[PDB]
Design a protein around this nucleic acid. Structure first.
Length: 173
RNA sequence: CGCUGGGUAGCCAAGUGCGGAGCGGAUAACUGCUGAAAGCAUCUAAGUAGUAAGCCCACCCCAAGAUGAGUGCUCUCCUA
């Protein structure tokens, strides 16, 4: 059910457990998440945390799986790191990086200057397709969604900022 | 004021001057991000992003009778 999970913590990954808190100090960043109430973890004498619902209800059962896989996103975050991929399909459409900014050429009257934050290391290895990388999967999310949310792909066109390997309905007219 | 022409100030306009803003914060519909309940999924249950002439502040004018009667820098006299 995912309620029961084994926390795979590889080497290099400090699991700083504190009273309703986890500070992971991993080789790529020190990510920090607080526990909810019913969800109680203990390190299980190996590099494997176990969140264990303390009080019996359904809301506990809810956040058991929830927070279990939150921590999993933390660990895999700092160690393996998250990627993300986009593809500015079409005429004209092309992006380029200005170190701290990501400027987009999307057929608008004006190029769209998406100033990125620091937590996110983006790049354009091929003039069309974009690449985002980051430590925390949520932030990577809001960012890639944001980039998509300027020219989400059109059906007929078939051809906008469709992040990689995402299915795109198409039509005749 | 007989009827007419012309007219300063005033008041007027069909004249002139300016004005509806970087606004910023929450939102509704909606699109989302991470994600289990439900060993897939789902915008949601935890938490977060965007976003409307709509809401609030901003703008402009009153306003401490706001009896909850505010604030302070000056005054005014202690001789019966």
């Amino acid at each position: 059910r995912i309620g029961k999970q084994p926390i795979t913590v590889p080497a290099n990954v400090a699991i700083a457990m504190e009273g309703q808190d986890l500070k992971v100090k991993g080789p790529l960043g020190e990510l920090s998440i607080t526990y909810p109430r019913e969800v109680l973890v203990e390190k299980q004498e190996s590099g494997f945390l176990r969140v264990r619902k303390a009080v019996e209800t359904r809301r506990a059962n809810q956040m058991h799986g929830l927070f279990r896989t939150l921590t999993d996103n933390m660990v895999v975050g700092v160690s393996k790191g998250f990627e993300k991929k986009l593809q500015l399909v079409g005429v004209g459409y092309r992006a380029t990086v200005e170190g701290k900014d990501l400027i987009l050429s999307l057929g608008f009257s004006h190029p769209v200057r998406m100033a990125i934050p620091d937590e996110l290391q983006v790049k354009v290895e091929e003039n069309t397709k974009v690449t985002v990388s980051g430590r925390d999967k949520s932030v990577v999310g809001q960012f890639a969604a944001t980039i998509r949310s300027w020219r989400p792909p059109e059906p007929y066109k078939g051809k906008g900022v469709r992040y990689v390997d995402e299915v795109v309905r198409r039509k005749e007219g």
